C-alpha cells in the first residue's frame, strides 16, 4: 500500500508543471485521491480532490481554474496539473488517499517541493519595524524604528501613514525630506540600516499604522507596519 | 561606599517597627539621606530627608505626623521610625544618599517590605 | 508640585533594537535636575542619568538622557536582555521630589 | 476571489501552540472547532521535520494500524483531544488535527512538542 | 477560621528571627502546624511540623539543627525560632494547619518575607567567559574569551588551569604574562574589558577548565569558567 | 614555595569548622593571604582576604558575619574560622597567596573539602509537574499532569492556585475533593503515581501558577509548578 | 548581478534530471561557472566546473561519468545533465560564479532540491542490537538483545555469525530453534519485539560480529550487528 | 565502484562544530588544511536554513563589499580563523571554509553558531 | 532510617581522626555495623565490623591495629577511630548498616572523604615511560621513552634495569651518563622534558623491565616502567 510521487522543481512564475503519483497496493480506481499542500513553515492544505466518475471533482479557491486533476486508472496514477504559476503556490504538494470514516488520510505520498520564483541568489532588502504597538496620548511623542538587512542606498526610504479604509499619505521621503502639506511635528532621520521616524507630539488625528519604504533598488519592499493608537 | 539596611517585616495595624541603614565608604555625617518607599506593583515615593544640622528635615504629607527620621552620626546609621501603621504603610523601603547635582539617589539600600495588615 | 509623566507605559521590543522613553514634566525642571533609574524585579532602583544628560559611573554609553525644560528623553541604543526592566525619571529640582509612573521595558 | 458563499469553512484551533516537555511525560493536545464535526470525522496527524504527515488517530478516537497505544484521541462536536500518554523521544513532531465531515476539508495550524 | 502571622523582614547573615503565627476560629490545640517557605521566583517547600502534647516535631534537612518550631497553647501561638540565617533562607514564610485526609493546608497564613543579606550588592565587576564549553581535538587551538562588565585597570587579569580534582594553576597573570613554567603554547592578551587566552596547540594534557580573575579592586571575582574537552 | 592546608570534612548545618594553612619558602608574616572556595561543579569564588598589621581584612557579602579569617605570623599559619555553616558554604577550600602585579594567586593550597549537611537523601517523593508552562486562551481547557517518583499512598495529593504576591489557596485534596468554594470547572483525578487537574474552561482569573503537594508521609514535597498564562 | 536557476524535483532511481542556471548583469562568457550541492543536514560540496572556449570541464569523482555540465554561452545559460541517479545524490544544488582570486564563489544561485527516491518512507521493522560491542574472555557468557520496533510475526528472527572475510553463518532461526552443526553454547529466545542470543561459555572461535534478522514480512531487514571481542 | 579515488584533495578541519554563544560575545571559528593552501586561496561562508550560502571572506582576508566589519578572516598556510568580533542575532547560522588553490575544491564540514 | 555521618577532612600522615554516625529510625542496638571506605577512583572496600557485645569486631588488614570501631548504643552512634593515618588511607569512608540475609547494607552513610596529605598545592613530577611493553629479538633495538609532566631541572634523569628477581642496577645517570660497567650498547639522551634510553643491539640478557627516575627536587619520582620481551 503505496504511493510513488514525482515530479515538482524550481520554475519561473507564470509557468507550468505537472506532478504524478504512482499507487499499488489497493483498488486505486474506486479509491478517492487528493492533492494537499505545505507552504514552506506553514500548515497543511488541501487543494484538490476527484473520485468515481459520476462524482464532482472539487478544488480550493487558491487552485480552481489553473490547476487540474486528473488520473488515468489504467495505470493507477494521479495527476495535478500545475498551471499560471505564482510565488503564492510555493509548497511541498503530497498526494494523499481519502477513507473517509475508514481512514482519513491514511496513505501519504512523501513529497515534492515546488517552489515558484524568478529571484536570484538572492536577498530582497528586509525591513523590521519596531515597536509592532505604540499606545499613546494626545500630546505626547512618538518614536518609530525602521532597520533595513541592507544598506539603503542614497538613504532612498519613505514613510507613509495610512488610516482604516483609506490610501496611504506620504510623510517623509529621502529618510529626512517632509512632503509638502505634512505637519513641521512629523521629522525622519537616519542613513545606511538605521531609520526612525519622529512625531513630536502626537494629535488625536496621528493614530494610524505606519509603513517604512525603501525604493533604492529595482524591488521595492515595506516594512510590516507600526500601530500607534 | 554602600548602605546595609535591615529591620521591617509583617506588622498589625497601628503597631510600630524602626528601621536601620549602616553606612560605610562615604563622609556619612556630611550626607543627606533619604527614605523612599514602593508599594507592591506601584512606582517610587519619597518618604523623607535628613541633612546636616541646621537644615530642616522633611516629610511627605503620607507620614508626616507617624514617622521620624533620625541618624547616629557616629555610628554611621540612619533611621526611620515608623508608628501608627497603616494598610497603605504596606511597601518596600529604601534608604538613599542624595548627591542632588552629583548624582541624584546615587546609592540605593537593597530595601526591606513593611507589610501592615491583620 | 511637579508632575511627571513617561510614555510609554509599555514598549515591547527585541535585542538589538532601541528604545526612547520620555519624560514630561508639568513645570520647567530648575538645573535640569532630572534623574533616570532603571529596576529589575525583586531589586532596588539602579541609576542611569543625572543631571539629564550626565550618565553615572560604570553605566554603559548604549544608555543616553538628553532634553531640558519641561521635554526629557531617555534612549537606550542597542537593548540587551539585562536592559529589559521598568524605567523611573525623576526631578529633584525643589523641595518635593517627585517620579514618573515608570515605563517598563519587555 | 472567491467561489464560496457568506458560509464559512470549519475552522480548527489547537492549542496550546507549543508543549515543551521530557520523555515520559504526558502530552495533552486541545483541537477546537468553530462548528460542530459531523460523524466526529476528525483526525490526528504527526509530522517530523522534512517527512510527510502520518496519521494517528481518526474518527476522534481511532487508532491507526501500527500506532502505539500510547496515542489515544477523545472527545465529539467541537472538543477534540490527544493524548499522548507516556512520551518517547520518537513522538517529538508537530501534531495536526484535520475534520473530514464536508466538502471543505481544513486543518488545524498545528501543536508543536519539543 | 484564620492564622494571623507577624514578623519576618531583612536581616544580615548568622543573625536570627523569629516568626509567629495566631490563630483564631478552630480547637488549635489540636491541629497539626506547618511552616512553608517560597523563595523568591522559586516553588513551595516544606520546613517544620508540630502536632499534639507527646510533640513529634519534624523539620526539612536543611533547617536541622538552626531552627526550632514550637507552639504556646494557652496564647494559640505557632513559633518558628530562625537562627544561622544564611543567603539561602531569604524566602517568604508561611504557618499553615494540616488537615490531612480532611484538607491538606486548608488555612494559610498571609506570608511574611524573610531576607538574609549583607548587603545590596553585588557592584562587584562581572566576568563572562566565552564559551562555556569548547570540544577540540589535539593540536587544534583553543581561543578563550573573557569580557569584563568594567575596565579593568592595570590588567589586573589572571587565567587558571584547573583538572579534576586538583588546584587551580596559574598559566597567565597582569593578561599577558606567562607564569613561571608554563609552556609558550599558552598566551593572553586583551585590555580594558576584553581579554582572551589562546591555547595555540593543544596537547592532550591542556585539556581541562579555564577561569579568568580580575584583582583590580578588593572585590575579587573569576569567571564561571571554560570547560576545553 | 609551599601551602600545607588541613581540617575540613562533614559538619551538620549550623556547625562550626577551622581551616588551617601552614607556608613555608617565602616570607609568610610580609605576604597577603586569601582564601578561595568552590562548590562542587561550580566555579571559583573569593571568601576573605588578610594582610600585613595596618591593613584591612575583607569578607564575601555571603560569610560576613559568619567567617573570620586570622593569622598567627610566629607559626607561619593561616586560619578560617567558620561558624553557622549552611549547605550553601559546601565547597573546596583553598588557601592561596596574592602577589597583586607580580603573579595574582601564584601559590596554592591543595584545597579541603567541607561538606555541610544533615542527611544523606534524598529518598523524598519527588514530584514532578507538567508542563512547566502553559500559555492559552480564557474558555480553553488545561490539563495538569503531576508525577510521582513512588506510590502516593491513600491518594493523599492536594492542588494549590497561587497568584503573584498572594498565599497559595487549597483547590483539590485527597487528588479528586473540591475543597469548599472551589469552583465546578476544577477537578483532580488520578491514583498511585499518576494525577491530573483540570480546568474544564478557563476564566481570566484562573491564570495563576498551581502546585501538587503529596502528604502521605513524614517529609512532605511539592511539585515545582505549571504556570498557566 | 544574479543567477537563476530552474529544474529539479522528485524522481525514481535510476531517472534522469537537467539543471539550468540563467546569467545576467555580467560577462557570462568569461566567467568560470560551477555546479555545487548540500545534501539535507549535510556541508558544501563541489560537483563539476566549466570555463571558456578550450572547454576544460572537471568533475567530482562522485558524478564523473554520470553528470555532465555545459553552458550555451548564446543564451547566457549554464546547464547540468544528472544521469544515473542515486538516493546519494539527494540535495540541493547550487550553480555559483566562480570568481577566483577576485571573489571565490561570490555569486550564487537560490538552489534546487533533487530528491531521488522510490518512495521510501518505512514500513519496514527496524531491528537495534545492543550492546553495539562486547569485551568478554573465554569462559564468560556472552548476551546479545534484539529488539523490533513493531511485533515479528510467527517469531521470524534469526541470528547470523560473520568472522572477518567470511560469509555470514546461521545459528538460530524461527527465533529459539538451533541450526544444524551449531554447539549447544548458543541459544535464542524471546517472542515479539524482544528478542535474545545467548553464548554460554565463549570459545576463542565465538569471537565475532552477529545479527539479527527478521523474516517476518516482505521487507527483511537485520539488525546493525554486536561485536564480541 | 570508483573513478580513481583517492586522493590529493586538500582537506579542511573545522573547529569546534558548535558554539554557543550569546549577542555580543566574541565567535572564533578555526579552518585547519591538510596541505598548504597555496596564494591562501581561501574563503568563508555563511548559511542561513533553508538560504544560499552567502560570501564573508575570500583571500583569507578579504572582507566581501558589503559585510560588516565585525566579520575578520586571518591566517595562512594551513591554519586559517573567522572572527566575529561581537556577535549579533542575525550572526547565528552555519559557516563553511572553502579552499580553492587546486582543481579540486573543497569545503569544510562547518561550524555551527547557535 | 537513617545515618548521619560526620568527621573527615585533610590531615597529617601518620595524624589521628575520628568519624561518627548518628542512627535513627531502627533499633540500633541489634544492628551490625560496619564501615566501607572508597579510594579516588577505585572500587568498595570493606574497613572494620562491629555487632553485639556478645560478638568480637573485624577489621581489613589495611586498617588493623591502626583503627578502633566501637558503638555507644545509649546515643545511637557508630565511631571509627583512625590512628596512625597514611596516605594509603585516603578515601571517602562510609557507615553502614548490615541487614546480612534481610538487607546486606541497606542504609548508608552519605560519607566523608578523608585525604592524608602533607603536600602543597603543586603536584609531583610525573614520569611517563611508553610504551609499556616492547616485544623484540636479539639483535634488534629497543627505544625507550621518559616523559616528565615538568622539565627536570639539571637533566637529573636516571635509567635502571630490573630482572625478575633481583634489585635495580644503574644503567644511565644525568640522562646521557653510562655507569660504570655498563656496556655502551645502554645510550641515553634528551633532556627539560624529553628523554630516551636506547639500546643498540639487544642481546637475550637485556630483556628486563627498564625504569626511568628523576632526582632533581626533594620528592623523587619513577616511571612506570617499561618491559622489553
Known amino acids: 500500500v503505496q504511493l510513488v510521487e514525482s515530479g515538482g522543481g524550481l520554475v519561473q512564475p507564470g509557468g507550468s508543471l505537472r506532478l504524478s503519483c504512482a499507487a499499488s497496493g489497493f483498488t486505486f480506481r474506486n479509491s478517492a485521491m487528493h492533492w494537499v499542500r505545505q507552504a514552506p513553515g506553514k500548515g497543511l492544505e488541501w487543494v484538490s480532490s476527484i473520485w468515481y466518475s459520476g462524482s464532482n471533482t472539487y478544488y480550493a479557491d487558491s487552485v480552481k481554474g489553473r490547476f487540474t486533476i486528473s488520473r488515468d486508472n489504467s495505470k493507477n496514477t494521479l495527476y495535478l496539473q500545475m498551471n499560471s504559476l505564482t510565488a503564492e503556490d510555493t509548497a511541498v504538494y503530497y498526494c494523499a488517499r481519502f477513507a473517509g470514516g475508514w481512514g482519513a488520510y491514511d496513505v501519504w505520498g512523501q513529497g515534492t517541493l515546488v517552489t515558484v520564483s524568478s529571484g536570484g541568489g538572492g536577498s530582497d532588502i528586509v525591513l523590521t519595524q519596531s515597536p509592532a504597538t505604540l499606545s499613546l496620548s494626545p500630546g505626547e511623542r512618538a518614536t518609530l524604528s525602521c532597520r533595513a538587512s541592507q544598506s539603503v542606498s542614497s538613504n532612498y526610504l519613505a514613510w507613509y501613514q495610512q488610516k482604516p479604509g483609506q490610501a496611504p499619505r506620504l510623510?517623509?521621503?529621502?529618510?529626512?525630506?517632509?512632503?509638502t502639506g505634512v505637519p513641521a511635528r512629523f521629522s525622519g532621520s537616519g542613513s545606511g540600516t538605521d531609520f526612525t521616524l519622529t512625531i513630536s507630539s502626537l494629535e488625536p488625528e496621528d493614530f494610524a499604522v505606519?509603513?517604512?519604504?525603501?525604493?533604492?533598488?529595482?524591488?521595492?519592499?515595506?516594512?510590516?507596519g507600526t500601530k500607534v493608537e | 561606599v554602600q548602605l546595609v539596611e535591615s529591620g521591617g517585616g509583617l506588622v498589625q495595624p497601628g503597631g510600630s517597627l524602626r528601621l536601620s541603614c549602616a553606612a560605610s565608604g562615604f563622609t556619612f555625617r556630611n550626607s543627606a539621606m533619604h527614605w523612599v518607599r514602593q508599594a507592591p506593583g506601584k512606582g517610587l515615593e519619597w518618604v523623607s530627608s535628613i541633612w546636616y544640622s541646621g537644615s530642616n528635615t522633611y516629610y511627605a504629607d503620607s507620614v508626616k505626623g507617624r514617622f521620624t527620621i533620625s541618624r547616629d552620626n557616629s555610628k554611621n546609621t540612619l533611621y526611620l521610625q515608623m508608628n501608627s501603621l497603616t494598610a497603605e504603610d504596606t511597601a518596600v523601603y529604601y534608604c538613599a544618599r542624595f548627591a542632588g547635582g552629583w548624582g541624584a539617589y546615587d546609592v540605593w539600600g537593597q530595601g526591606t517590605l513593611v507589610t501592615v495588615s491583620s | 508640585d511637579i508632575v511627571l509623566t513617561q510614555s510609554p507605559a509599555t514598549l515591547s521590543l527585541s535585542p538589538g533594537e532601541r528604545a526612547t522613553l520620555s519624560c514630561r514634566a508639568s513645570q520647567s525642571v530648575s538645573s535640569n535636575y532630572l534623574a533616570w533609574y532603571q529596576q529589575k524585579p525583586g531589586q532596588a532602583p539602579r541609576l542611569?542619568?543625572?543631571?539629564?544628560?550626565?550618565?553615572?559611573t560604570g553605566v554603559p554609553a548604549r544608555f543616553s538622557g538628553s532634553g531640558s525644560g519641561t521635554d526629557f528623553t531617555l534612549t537606550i541604543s542597542s537593548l540587551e536582555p539585562e536592559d529589559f526592566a521598568v524605567?523611573?525619571?525623576?526631578?529633584?529640582?525643589?523641595?518635593?521630589?517627585?517620579?514618573?509612573?515608570g515605563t517598563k521595558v519587555e | 476571489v472567491s467561489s464560496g458563499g457568506g458560509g464559512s469553512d470549519i475552522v480548527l484551533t489547537q492549542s496550546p501552540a507549543t508543549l515543551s516537555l521530557s520523555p515520559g511525560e504526558r502530552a495533552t493536545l486541545s483541537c477546537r472547532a468553530s462548528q460542530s464535526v459531523s460523524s466526529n470525522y476528525l483526525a490526528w496527524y504527526q509530522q517530523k521535520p522534512g517527512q510527510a504527515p502520518r496519521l494517528?488517530?481518526?474518527?476522534?478516537?481511532?487508532?491507526?494500524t501500527g500506532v502505539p497505544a500510547r496515542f489515544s484521541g477523545s472527545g465529539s462536536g467541537t472538543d477534540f483531544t490527544l493524548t499522548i500518554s507516556s512520551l518517547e523521544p520518537e513522538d517529538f513532531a508537530v501534531?495536526?488535527?484535520?475534520?473530514?465531515?464536508?466538502?471543505?476539508?481544513?486543518?488545524?495550524?498545528g501543536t508543536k512538542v519539543e | 477560621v484564620q492564622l494571623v502571622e507577624s514578623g519576618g523582614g531583612l536581616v544580615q547573615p548568622g543573625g536570627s528571627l523569629r516568626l509567629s503565627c495566631a490563630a483564631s476560629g478552630f480547637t488549635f490545640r489540636n491541629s497539626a502546624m506547618h511552616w512553608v517557605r517560597q523563595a523568591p521566583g522559586k516553588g513551595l517547600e516544606w520546613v517544620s511540623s508540630i502536632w499534639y502534647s507527646g510533640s513529634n516535631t519534624y523539620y526539612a534537612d536543611s533547617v536541622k539543627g538552626r531552627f526550632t518550631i514550637s507552639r504556646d497553647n494557652s496564647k494559640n501561638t505557632l513559633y518558628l525560632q530562625m537562627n544561622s540565617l544564611t543567603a539561602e533562607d531569604t524566602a517568604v514564610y508561611y504557618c499553615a494547619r494540616f488537615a490531612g485526609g480532611w484538607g491538606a493546608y486548608d488555612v494559610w497564613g498571609q506570608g511574611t518575607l524573610v531576607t538574609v543579606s549583607s548587603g545590596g550588592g553585588g557592584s562587584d565587576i562581572v566576568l563572562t567567559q566565552s564559551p562555556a564549553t569548547l570540544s577540540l581535538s589535539p593540536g587544534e587551538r583553543a581561543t578563550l574569551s573573557c569580557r569584563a562588565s568594567q575596565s579593568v585597570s592595570s590588567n589586573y587579569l589572571a587565567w587558571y588551569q584547573q583538572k579534576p580534582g586538583q588546584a587551580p594553576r596559574l598559566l597567565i597573570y597582569?593578561?599577558?604574562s606567562r607564569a613561571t613554567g608554563v609552556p609558550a603554547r599558552f598566551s593572553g592578551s586583551g585590555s580594558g574589558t576584553d581579554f582572551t587566552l589562546t591555547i595555540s596547540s593543544l596537547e592532550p594534557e591542556d585539556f581541562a577548565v579555564y577561569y579568568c580573575?580580575?584583582?583590580?579592586?578588593?572585590?575579587?571575582?573569576f569567571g564561571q569558567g571554560t570547560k576545553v574537552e | 614555595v609551599q601551602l600545607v592546608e588541613s581540617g575540613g570534612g562533614l559538619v551538620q548545618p549550623g556547625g562550626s569548622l577551622r581551616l588551617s594553612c601552614a607556608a613555608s619558602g617565602f616570607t609568610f608574616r610580609n605576604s597577603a593571604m586569601h582564601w578561595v572556595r568552590q562548590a562542587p561543579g561550580k566555579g571559583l569564588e573569593w571568601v576573605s582576604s588578610i594582610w600585613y598589621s595596618g591593613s584591612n581584612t575583607y569578607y564575601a557579602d555571603s560569610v560576613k558575619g559568619r567567617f573570620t579569617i586570622s593569622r598567627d605570623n610566629s607559626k607561619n599559619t593561616l586560619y578560617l574560622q567558620m561558624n553557622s555553616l549552611t549547605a550553601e558554604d559546601t565547597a573546596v577550600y583553598y588557601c592561596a597567596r596574592f602577589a597583586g602585579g607580580w603573579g595574582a594567586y601564584d601559590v596554592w593550597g591543595q584545597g579541603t573539602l567541607v561538606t555541610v549537611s544533615s542527611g544523606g537523601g534524598g529518598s523524598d517523593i519527588v514530584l514532578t509537574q507538567s508542563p512547566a508552562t502553559l500559555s492559552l486562551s480564557p474558555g480553553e481547557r488545561a490539563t495538569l499532569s503531576c508525577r510521582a517518583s513512588q506510590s502516593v499512598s491513600s491518594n493523599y495529593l492536594a492542588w494549590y492556585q497561587q497568584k503573584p504576591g498572594q498565599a497559595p489557596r487549597l483547590?483539590?485534596?485527597?487528588?479528586?475533593?473540591?475543597?469548599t468554594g472551589v469552583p465546578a470547572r476544577f477537578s483532580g483525578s488520578g491514583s498511585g503515581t499518576d494525577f491530573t487537574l483540570t480546568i474544564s474552561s478557563l476564566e481570566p482569573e484562573d491564570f495563576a501558577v498551581?502546585?501538587?503537594?503529596?502528604?502521605?508521609?513524614?517529609?512532605?514535597?511539592?511539585?515545582?509548578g505549571t504556570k498557566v498564562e | 548581478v544574479q543567477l537563476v536557476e530552474s529544474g529539479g524535483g522528485l524522481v525514481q532511481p535510476g531517472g534522469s534530471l537537467r539543471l539550468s542556471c540563467a546569467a545576467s548583469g555580467f560577462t557570462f562568457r568569461n566567467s568560470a561557472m560551477h555546479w555545487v550541492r548540500q545534501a539535507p543536514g549535510k556541508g558544501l560540496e563541489w560537483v563539476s566546473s566549466i570555463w571558456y572556449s578550450g572547454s576544460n570541464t572537471y568533475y567530482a569523482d562522485s558524478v564523473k561519468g554520470r553528470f555532465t555540465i555545459s553552458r550555451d554561452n548564446s543564451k547566457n545559460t549554464l546547464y547540468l545533465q544528472m544521469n544515473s541517479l542515486t538516493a546519494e545524490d539527494t540535495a540541493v544544488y547550487y550553480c555559483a560564479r566562480f570568481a577566483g582570486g577576485w571573489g571565490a564563489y561570490d555569486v550564487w544561485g537560490q538552489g534546487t532540491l533533487v530528491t531521488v527516491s522510490s518512495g521510501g518512507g518505512g514500513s519496514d521493522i527496524v531491528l537495534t542490537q545492543s550492546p553495539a560491542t562486547l569485551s568478554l574472555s573465554p569462559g564468560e557468557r556472552a548476551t546479545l538483545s534484539c529488539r523490533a520496533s513493531q511485533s515479528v510475526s510467527s517469531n521470524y528472527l534469526a541470528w547470523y555469525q560473520q568472522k572477518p572475510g567470511q560469509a555470514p553463518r546461521l545459528?538460530?532461526?524461527?527465533?529459539?530453534?538451533?541450526?544444524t552443526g551449531v554447539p549447544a553454547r548458543f541459544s535464542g529466545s524471546g517472542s515479539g519485539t524482544d528478542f535474545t542470543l545467548t553464548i554460554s561459555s565463549l570459545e576463542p572461535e565465538d569471537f565475532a560480529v552477529?545479527?539479527?534478522?527478521?523474516?517476518?514480512?516482505?521487507?527483511?531487514?537485520?539488525?546493525?550487528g554486536t561485536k564480541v571481542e | 565502484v570508483s573513478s580513481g579515488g583517492g586522493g590529493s584533495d586538500i582537506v579542511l578541519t573545522q573547529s569546534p562544530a558548535t558554539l554557543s554563544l550569546s549577542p555580543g560575545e566574541r565567535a572564533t571559528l578555526s579552518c585547519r588544511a591538510s596541505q598548504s593552501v597555496s596564494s591562501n586561496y581561501l574563503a568563508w561562508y555563511q548559511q542561513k536554513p533553508g538560504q544560499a550560502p552567502r560570501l564573508?571572506?575570500?583571500?583569507?582576508?578579504?572582507?566581501?563589499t558589503g559585510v560588516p566589519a565585525r566579520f575578520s578572516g586571518s591566517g595562512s598556510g594551513t591554519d586559517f580563523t573567522l572572527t566575529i568580533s561581537s556577535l549579533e542575532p542575525e550572526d547565528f547560522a552555519v559557516?563553511?571554509?572553502?579552499?580553492?588553490?587546486?582543481?579540486?575544491?573543497?569545503?569544510?564540514?562547518g561550524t555551527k553558531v547557535e | 532510617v537513617q545515618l548521619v555521618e560526620s568527621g573527615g577532612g585533610l590531615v597529617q600522615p601518620g595524624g589521628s581522626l575520628r568519624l561518627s554516625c548518628a542512627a535513627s529510625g531502627f533499633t540500633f542496638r541489634n544492628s551490625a555495623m560496619h564501615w566501607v571506605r572508597q579510594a579516588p577512583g577505585k572500587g568498595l572496600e570493606w574497613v572494620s565490623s562491629i555487632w553485639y557485645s556478645g560478638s568480637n569486631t573485624y577489621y581489613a588488614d589495611s586498617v588493623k591495629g591502626r583503627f578502633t570501631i566501637s558503638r555507644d548504643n545509649s546515643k545511637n552512634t557508630l565511631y571509627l577511630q583512625m590512628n596512625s593515618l597514611t596516605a594509603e588511607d585516603t578515601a571517602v569512608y562510609y557507615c553502614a548498616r548490615f541487614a546480612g540475609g534481610w538487607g546486606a547494607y541497606d542504609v548508608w552513610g552519605q560519607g566523608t572523604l578523608v585525604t592524608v596529605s602533607s603536600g602543597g598545592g603543586g603536584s609531583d613530577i610525573v614520569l611517563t615511560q611508553s610504551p609499556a611493553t616492547l616485544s623484540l629479538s636479539p639483535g634488534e633495538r629497543a627505544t625507550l621513552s621518559c616523559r616528565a609532566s615538568q622539565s627536570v631541572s639539571s637533566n637529573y634523569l636516571a635509567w635502571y634495569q630490573q630482572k625478575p628477581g633481583q634489585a635495580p642496577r644503574l644503567?644511565?645517570?644525568?640522562?646521557?651518563?653510562?655507569?660504570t660497567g655498563v656496556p655502551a650498547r645502554f645510550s641515553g639522551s634528551g633532556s627539560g622534558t624529553d628523554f630516551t634510553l636506547t639500546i643498540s643491539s639487544l642481546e637475550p640478557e637485556d630483556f628486563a623491565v627498564?625504569?626511568?627516575?628523576?632526582?632533581?627536587?626533594?620528592?623523587?619520582?619513577?616511571?612506570?616502567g617499561t618491559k622489553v620481551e
Open positions: 580573575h580580575q584583582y583590580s579592586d578588593i572585590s575579587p571575582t
Open positions: 597582569d593578561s599577558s
